[PDB]
Amino acid sequence: SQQPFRPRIKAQLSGSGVSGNTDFEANYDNLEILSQTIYPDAFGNSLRSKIKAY
Amino acid sequence: MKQKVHSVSYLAKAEFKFNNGVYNLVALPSGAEVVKVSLEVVGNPIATSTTSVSVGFEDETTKNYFLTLDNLAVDDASKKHTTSAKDYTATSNKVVVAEVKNANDNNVKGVLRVLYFLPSVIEVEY
Amino acid sequence: MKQKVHSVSYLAKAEFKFNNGVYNLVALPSGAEVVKVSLEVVGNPIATSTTSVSVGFEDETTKNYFLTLDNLAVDDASKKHTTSAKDYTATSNKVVVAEVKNANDNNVKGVLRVLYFLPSVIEVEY
Amino acid sequence: MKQKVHSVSYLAKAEFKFNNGVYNLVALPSGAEVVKVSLEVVGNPIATSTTSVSVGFEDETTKNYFLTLDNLAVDDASKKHTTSAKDYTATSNKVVVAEVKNANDNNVKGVLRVLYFLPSVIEVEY
Amino acid sequence: RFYIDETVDAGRKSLVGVDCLLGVSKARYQSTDGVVTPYDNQDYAVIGLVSDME
Predict the structure, then answer these.
(1) Which of B25, B28, C122, D65 could bond D56 through an S-S bridge, CB–CB 3.0 to 4.6 Å?
(2) How many cross-chain Cβ pairs, C to D, lie less than 8 Å apart?
(3) How many CB pairs under 8 A join B and D?
(4) CB–CB of B19/B99 below 8 Å?
């Protein structure tokens, strides 16, 4: 559809978790999603011919 | 490094009307770790306001364990919010109570905010 | 002994850069119990710094309800940290903001920490 | 307004008995948000008490970041409970420690209460 | 009643709870009307035997 496209990547998961008998809720991790927006451009060229006879 | 921490916390907000008497404001269970006790005054204590308010416990002779408050009109900017300098651990079920005496002003009100942790503990390691 | 308590509590931390202006720092729901508001300056304020920061509310005209903080040079240790003496019940969705004015410092920063309890309420029997 | 806030909060309570040395009281995770540090003096300190207490960090050289408490006789009433005026974000795993020196007393103990929020954040809408 | 919640800490921890609902009272009857009887405000079947704790 040549609409502006948007690709997404999943960032790698980092950050220290939880040690020992500690609740998962003491250090949540963040699922991080990055994106890009690709917009189209229009471009062109043209040749103008001379009189048919020539 | 292990430890045991309190994880469950409650805030109790009670409201009383600055008349001569006692008010059973906050119910503490045994083992409650009181970490904040604050009294907000609501209203305009008029001049000649000889009203005295003390936040303490119910089962004590002088119910002023946490706060004493007097001469509200001396400076309505600082005597309007007064927090307690003392934390507390409840050995038994306690009742935080406000004792109001010599109430000579009208439409003045008090709000007691008590932030306390529950006796329950969990074991955490960092 | 029955009572109603707030059991859910949040801490909102927001850092701003002490440039002149007003910053939308913290979003309070209607019925939130604000029990702690503290501001820490982070940096090394030069002498002759007549900068003034003030933590208050967005909708109100004067943003000095919670904290005023002037003359960050007289004592570079007592003014590093300043806690608010006032608790607050949010009767509407509020926005805690910090107004900075006369900013003649550099690289100095301000971290606001707000501990507030949610409106939700449970019943407890002790 | 969206925001990221800390929802998990722990209270850590530790006791020490005021004999000269260093005690490893509280373990702070990396990213923790210390919102209250308070020390209570249990026991009646003797007159002419030349003892000193200080609440700080294990790694730091002078263990006096949060709290200091000297001359437990100048004003016992106000020298019974002392709250730190500072809030702290932990950039690494930390240990809040007591540095007590010159213990010319006994039958006296200190109780440290550290209320801190955990690093994890959730997003809230209001 | 027993309540076994195997879903604490995303199902990593676990919780076991016990609950009871019970009505307990020392038999002490009152008259339905105001008529006074030997029974109307007395421990039905109890005598107290108090001595020192030694």
Answers:
(1) D65
(2) 48
(3) 52
(4) no
